[PDB]
Amino acid sequence: FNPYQKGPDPTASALERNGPFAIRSTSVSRTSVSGFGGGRLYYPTASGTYGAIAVSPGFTGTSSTMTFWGERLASHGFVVLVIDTITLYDQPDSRARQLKAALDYLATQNGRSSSPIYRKVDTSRRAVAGHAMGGGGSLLAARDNPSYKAAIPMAPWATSSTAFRTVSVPTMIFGCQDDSAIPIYNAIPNSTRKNYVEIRDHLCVMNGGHDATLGKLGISWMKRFVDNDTRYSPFVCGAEYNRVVSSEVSRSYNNCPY
């Protein structure tokens, strides 16, 4: 009995579409929060306590460019806050701090009976994700906050790959072959559970056309690590992953099994 397990036993097709949790979304206003630029909160309406995921857009990106991830993750049983940055021009380090703020905001809101997500978040199970500089942001957050359960940097950008040589959070990186992501993956300690999947734009991961495959891989990673849902092992390490990776995928690395 995994107490964090949610949703039906997984299938490829169910992971290639919006999931079985009905979700609502609300706007988090800039005026309500000091540590980030507000954003879009997606949450399963169904009773329960869920893992919390904060997702960063990249450089000049808005929460609206990442709504795919809000809906896709939340609809498979996560509370997902797609942040807007304090400015469009915020660097990775600032995106990292804003992702950490967004997760702390989710923990604070969890405890307020005023909040639609009152008692809906397991504040012990947090993950980060983001696109480009938001990817670098997610990975810096995960570096600084090893209690986090998972990171998914998608087309990650940073000024240094050696910055990630202490990452201790299970990290799935998405690459777009015709775009940095590999030096980042190589820098992560091989003692850290990690996975690289290269799709064949820079915004091939952004709201992209490989939505099916990237969504499946991403939900699977959050399930496996945020929920400890070993039902998804076939989808991140086993026969299903190997099917995905063998097809659309130019290259993949991992240190499977986990």
Residue numbers in the entry: 24 to 202, 210 to 230, 233 to 239, 241 to 280, 282 to 292
Article passage:
Substituting His/Phe with Ser/Ile should expand the substrate-binding pocket to accommodate the bulkier substrate PET, and the strategy termed “double mutation (DM)” has proven to be useful to enhance PET hydrolytic activity of several IsPETase-like enzymes. Here, we report our experience in establishing the P. pastoris strain that expresses a PET hydrolytic enzyme from Caldimonas taiwanensis termed CtPL-DM that was identified from sequence mining from GenBank and modified by the DM strategy. In contrast to the protein expressed in Escherichia coli, CtPL-DM expressed in P. pastoris is inactive in PET degradation. Structural analysis indicates that a putative N-glycosylation site N181 could restrain the conformational change of a substrate-binding Trp and hamper the enzyme action.
